[PDB]
Each structure stands twice: as C-alpha cells, then as structure tokens.
DNA sequence: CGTACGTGCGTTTAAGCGGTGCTAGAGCTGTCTACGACCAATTGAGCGGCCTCGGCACCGGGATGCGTTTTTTTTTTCGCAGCGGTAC
DNA sequence: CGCTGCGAAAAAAAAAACGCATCCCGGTGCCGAGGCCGCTCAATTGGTCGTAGACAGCTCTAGCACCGCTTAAACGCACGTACGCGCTG
C-alpha cells in the first residue's frame, strides 16, 4: 500500500504546528482586498497605512481563533469533536455578540 | 469584487487549528466568512469615523486601534 | 469453571427471564457474569452469536438491527 | 388527588416569575451574607438600606442571566436539566474563569 | 459564619425559574451559592474600597453603583 | 435501564412587619495651611540621523523518536480426533 | 468415555520493520538592534499667589437591636415518572 495517516492524526499535528507559531494564517492580499471592499461601504477612494491593514489582520485572526476556542468547547459540551454552526452560534449568543 | 471568498477553506482551517479544533463541519467556512465580515464591518466603521473626524482620506494604524479599543478588543503593538 | 459454546452458553439466563419483548443484549450480558464464566471479549462473541441466530432463524429479533434490540428464543 | 407530571408546575412557575419583577431571595439572609463578606475586607462596617437592595438587584439580575445562558448550554447538549458543567461552560465563555 | 446556606434551594429555584430553566440537578444549588459568593465578594471589595477612599464607616448605594459599573455590571435606579 | 429529580402534603422555622429606643456616623459650616498652579529662565534628558557586527532565520544533512502497517509471536479459547483408565 | 492435548484459531498483542515528520547541528548572510553624534524642547529651579482640602466641631439621618403577632415560606420525606445516560449499528 502507499503510506497513510488516520483521520484526526494530521489535524492534531496541524494543531501543534499552529499553536506553536505566531505567523498570520490568512493570505495578506486577499485580506487587504476584503478590508478595502468593506471600507467602500463607508467612504470611497480611501487609503490605508500598510500598518493599519495588519493591525486589523492581527485583530481579526486573534478574534476568530478565540471564537473557535469557545466554539470547540460548545462542540465538546454536546459530546462531539466536530465544530458546527450551532456551536459558534451558542458561543456568540453567550459572548453577547448577537441576541 | 467578492473578496470574502479569498478567505480560503484552508485559511479558516489553519485558524480553527491554532484555536485547537480537531474536526470541522462543511457549513463552518461560510458561517466563519459570515462572522469575520461582521467583525471587519463593525471595526472598520468606527475606524473610518476616526479617520473622517480627523478630516483625513488615509486610515492610520491609530484609527483601527482607537476602534478596536472602543469595541472591547484592545490591541498592543500598533501604538497607543 | 466452564464457558460452553455460543450455541449453548447462557440459554439458561435467556429462558430464565420470560419477557414479551424477549431478552435484550444488556440484561443477558448481566447474567453470564452473575453465575457462569467468560473472558473479556465475551460481549463481542455474544453479538456474533446473536447475528448467526438472526440470519439462520435460531433466535428471532423483536425490534432493532444487528445486536441492537431484543432477541427471543426459537419457540 | 390532583398531581401534575414532573415538569408541568415548573412550566407554570416559569410563566409566573418571568411575568413579575419582585426580588426572589429573602432579604435578611441576603443582608447578613453581605456583612459576612464585608467583614473579610473591613471590620465594623455599616450599610445604607438602599446599597444592600442595589446589591440584591445586581445579584438576582446576574444569576437570572446566567440561568438563561446555563439553560441554553444544557439544551445545546440535547438536555433539559441544568448541571454545574452547564454554568461552568457559560462563565468560561462569558470570561468569568479560565 | 455560614450564611451562604441561607440562600435556600427553593430561592435559587425561583431565580432559575425566572431565567427559564425547567429542570435542576441537586449538584446546582451549591455551585450557584458558590458563584453568588464570588460575585458579591468581587463587587463589595470594590464597593468598600470606594467607601474606604471616602473615609466613611458606612457603605453607600453609590459605592455599590460605582463598583457595579467598574465590573461592567452597570445598574439603573439607585443614583446612576 | 437506572436513577435522580418533581409534586405535594405534612412539620419546623424564621422572615416579615410595625413600632420603639439609643447613638454612630454622615455631612455641613467656618477658619487657616499647606500645597499646587502660574511664570520665567536655565538647563540636559531624550529624540531623530548615522554606522557596525551578531543574533536570528535559513538551509541542507543526518539522528531521534512516533505512527503506520504488517509480520511473528504469546496468550488465550474453542472444537475434533486421539488418548489412558473404568467397567465388565 | 472424559480428559486432554493439541492444534488450531482467534485475537492479543507485540514486535519489528518501514517511512515519515520533528529536532538539532554548524556555517551562510542579512537586517535590525544597539550604540554612538548633535541638538532641540520639555523637565527643573525657585518663588509668587490664591484656594483646595484638613480640622474642629454642630446637626439630625439613618442605620443597628429588641420584640413578639402573623403568616408564608423553608424543611423534608415519600412516591413515582420522566429524563440522562450508555451501548450498537
Ligand atoms: K447618618
Ligand atoms: K491643607
């Protein structure tokens, strides 16, 4: 046979990898393009200090990761291992981000 | 264009990983892109207000910091 | 200390428990260890032994699938 | 011999108390508890009657809200009873413990 | 030296009832009393500190308010 | 399938109430002191340019341990035919 | 016959082989820390003014005890039912 790891093993290696590192996990430009998009909804022909974009990317990722953390606990709370919309939803409801 | 889809399935995975998630439902990627959108939306607004009040056309690292601090979400390393 | 065949192991527990739904896999598992002898696999051998009765027609199956659900005697 | 089934008087009591606004903790026990806890931080302290009730308002508000968050955590795990682990989850997510 | 136990099983139930809970583990009431303790402790600490800084031997409703506010647990109708 | 809540009826309690009695302590007034705002002038602490060299990321190249399969073995666990002693 | 021994046969389980990913070793090479150069504006000095806050008391509130009557809760126990919990497919 050709060698193969078992569903959840590579995931765990990938957890160890990304909990060890600090580097931003979203692709810089795609994120930038997203930022300038969501900026057009408030004023046109805006500009952004290179540093203001990063300050957002660091602010976004940091945020999501901590949500996933609170999410992953609401999955585990329902005797699961798989995060699903209703888990995020519970996080945010309890966090008081939605109603 | 539609740049929200530039937040690749792999990217949202890498983020769930650093958050300590083993297994991910398919439905998550669009919920996630969902929430990210609302985050960047609420934050950029308050930033641009700070940009606008300052009568500038360029959003400064501080604008975003003032914004994040406002929203509950203080950030170290971009000043202030 | 004798643990007979799966074609005559704990027939005494099944037949010494007259029920209308018949005997389940839990209730029967809780008798082999309350009087007779058995290993650790015991339960996974009981299952393969209620599956060889389900397909042939030795012991009927009230409700459920596989091992799951109650299983009564031939007659 | 009028008896109702485990959970039907609950559903009533919910509707009664969700509708009213009176404080649900008996007030003396409460008042004492405060002084007990004030001792810890300074001896021979005195309390404005209104300061106490302000604390009773805050507390009964706190708990009721927890219970609303607890109760969802419960339902989230396909249950209908709230258990310490439910609260524990709530507070952890709220940011009240690590 | 144990008034905590004054916070009666049937009272904690009344709070849970207003909070929309239908069914209650026994293990709960203690955990509850527990949480209430921390919450009162937390607030009164900050309260009395307001009292002490104002060289008063009487804690005032405003002490309790300035505190609830500090804790982000802001309260209306006691002198806000 | 097991059990731990929920209802409810029956005892135990102590909260609540309304009023009374004593007194700390809140919270104000006037007086006067010490402390801090304001200004001016004189400084050097602290900041924006330069110019290294060394700590850090990197890279390729073995080395240690970690997970996968899958080969060989150890231990247990039935089932079939091949015993040694009964019985007669 | 029963016993038994063996011979599988069945998993266990182990071991071991394989191959893959994570660490670490030691010499590159690059860039940003870290350390000098002047120099400029913000901290210090010292000293004038005027008023915030310390104090010394004067008041009258409102907060702490005590005290039985009257209940509505609490305590509590017993019985039973609906729910939480675990295994399998
Ligand atoms: K007073
Ligand atoms: K003074």
Q: Is E3 helix (H, G, I), strand (E, B) or coil?
A: coil
How far is B38 from A68, CA to CA, in rounded Å? 16
Which among D47, D51, D80 has the least Cβ separation from residue E22?
D80
Is A25 within 8 Å of B11 (Cβ atoms)? yes
Torsion of CA E43, E45, E51, E52, to 10 degrees: -160
In chain C, what are the domain boundaries?
Answer: 1-75
User: Nearest to residue B21, comparing CAs of A17, A78, A72?
Assistant: A72
Q: What's the CA-to-centroid distance between A19 and ligand 2, angstroms?
A: 57
Largest CA distance in chain D: 54
Half-sphere exposure of E64 (CA within 13 A, CB side): 27
Mutation choice for D interface testing from A77, A85, A87, A98 by most D CBs within 10 A: A77
**DSSP output for B13-42:** HHHHHHTT-SEE-TTHHHHHHHHHHHHHHH
Tokens of A3: 């060698």
Where does chain C show beta strands of DSSP type E? none
What is the Cα gyration radius of chain B?
15
Angle at B59 between CA B54 and CA B64, to 5 degrees: 95
Q: How many angstroms separate the Cα of E51 from the Cα of each of A55, D56, E38? A: 41, 18, 20
Cβ–Cβ below 8 Å for B40 and A56: yes
Quoted resolution (Å): 2.9
How far is C57 from D4, CA to CA, in rounded Å? 46
Tokens of A41: 């909804």
Give the determination technique: X-ray
β-bridge mates for residue D81, sequence order: E23
Angle at B76 between CA B74 and CA B80, to 5 degrees: 85
Q: Which ligand lies nearest the alpha carbon of E57? A: 1
How far is A34 from E1, CA to CA, in rounded Å? 60
Burial class from Cβ neighbours inside 10 Å (0-12, 13-18, 19+) for residue C5 reads exposed
Q: How many angstroms separate the Cα of E15 from the Cα of each of A26, C21, E7? A: 45, 44, 11
How far is A58 from A24, CA to CA, in rounded Å? 7
Tokens of E12: 């904690």
Torsion of CA A88, A91, A95, A98, to 10 degrees: 50
Contacts of A90 in chain D (CB under 8 A): 72-73, 76
């Amino acid at each position: 046979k050709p060698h193969r790891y078992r569903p959840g093993t590579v995931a765990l290696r990938e957890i160890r990898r990304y909990q060890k590192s600090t580097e931003l996990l979203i692709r810089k430009l795609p994120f930038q393009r997203l930022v300038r998009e969501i900026a057009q909804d408030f004023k046109t022909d805006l500009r952004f200090q290179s540093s203001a974009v990063m300050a957002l990317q660091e602010a976004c990722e940091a945020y999501l990761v901590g949500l996933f953390e609170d999410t992953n606990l609401c999955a585990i709370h329902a005797k699961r291992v798989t995060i699903m919309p209703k888990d995020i939803q519970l996080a945010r409801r309890i966090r008081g981000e939605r109603a | 264009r539609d740049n929200i889809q530039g937040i690749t399935k792999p990217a949202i995975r890498r983020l769930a990983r650093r958050g300590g998630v083993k297994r991910i439902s398919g439905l998550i990627y669009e919920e996630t892109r969902g929430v990210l959108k609302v985050f960047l939306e609420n934050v950029i607004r308050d930033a641009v207000t700070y940009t606008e009040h300052a009568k500038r056309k360029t959003v400064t690292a501080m604008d975003v910091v003032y914004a994040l601090k406002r929203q509950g979400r203080t950030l170290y390393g971009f000043g202030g | 200390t004798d643990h007979p065949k799966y074609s005559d192991m704990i027939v005494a527990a099944i037949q010494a428990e007259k029920n209308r739904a018949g005997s389940s896999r839990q209730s029967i598992q809780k008798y082999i260890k309350s009087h007779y002898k058995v290993g650790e696999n015991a339960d996974s051998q009981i299952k393969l032994s209620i599956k060889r009765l389900v397909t042939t027609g030795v012991l009927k199956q009230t409700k459920g699938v596989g091992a799951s659900g109650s299983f009564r005697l031939a007659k």
